[PDB]
């Protein structure tokens, strides 16, 4: 599906998030009434 | 499907997000009533 | 499908997002009532 | 080769379905 | 090769379904 | 190779469904 790879020799701040898959999920950034 | 690769010798701030796949998901950035 | 590759010798801020594929998903940036 | 780089990124939005984004930038280089 | 880099990132939003993002940037390099 | 890097990250938001993000950045490099 996806062979992701991050390779950093020198990283001041290394942030990495991996999600296997998203199925039937409603993702909303900002919501207002 | 996708052979992604990020290679940085020197990164001040390295941010990497990997999602295997999105299936049947309603993604909305900004929502207003 | 896609052999993506990002190669930076020196990056102040390195941001990389990889998605395997999007199937049957309604993606909306800005939504208004 | 040699390169003096000064970058100022503000309000950077990365990702699928990016919503409202606002940004104000100002440069006073080589002054 | 040799590179003097100065980066200033503020308000960086990364991810799916990014909402309201605001940012103000200013550069006074080489002054 | 040789590289002098100075990064200043503030208000970095990483993840799915990122909401309100604000950021102010300023650079005074090479002055």
Nearest to D14 by CA among A7, C18, A32: C18
What resolution, expressed in A, was reported for this entry?
A: 3.1
Q: Determination technique for this PDB entry?
A: cryo-EM
Q: Which residues of B touch C22 (CB under 8 A)?
A: 21-22
Instruction: Give strand pairing partners of E26.
Output: D26, F26
Give the whole-angstrom CA distance, residue B7 versus residue B11.
Answer: 10
Separation of alpha carbons D12 and A32, rounded Å: 22
- Residue C31 to residues A4, E2, F20: CA-CA distances in angstroms? 31, 46, 15
Burial C1-33 (b: 16+ CB within 10 A, else e): eeeeebebebbbbbbbbbbbbbeebebebbbee
In whole angstroms, give the CA distance from residue D29 to residue D7: 11
* DSSP 8-class letter at E30: T
**What secondary structure, in 3-state letters, does A1-33 show?**
CCCCCEEEEEEEEEEEEEECCEECCCEEEEECC
Q: What is the largest CA-CA distance in chain B?
A: 46
Give yes or no for a contact between F10 and B13, defined as CB atoms under 8 angstroms apart. no
DSSP type of residue E20: -
CB contacts of E17 in chain A (<8 Å) are 27-29
Of B13, B17, B19, the CB nearest to F7: B13
Judged by CB atoms closer than 8 Å, whether chains meet at F7 and B10 is answered as no
User: Could you tell me if C20 and D16 are in contact, meaning their C-beta atoms sit under 8 angstroms apart?
Assistant: no
Give residue A5's Cα distance to chain centre. Answer: 12
> Do D20 and B28 lie within an 8 Å CB cutoff?
no
Q: Within 10 A of A6 (CB to CB), how many other CB atoms are there? A: 24
Residue with tokens 């020799």: A9
Tell me the three state secondary structure of residue C13: strand
């Amino acid at each position: 599906g996806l062979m992701a790879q991050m390779a950093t020799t020198a990283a001041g701040v290394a942030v990495g998030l991996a999600v296997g898959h998203v199925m039937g999920s409603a993702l909303t950034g900002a919501f207002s009434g």
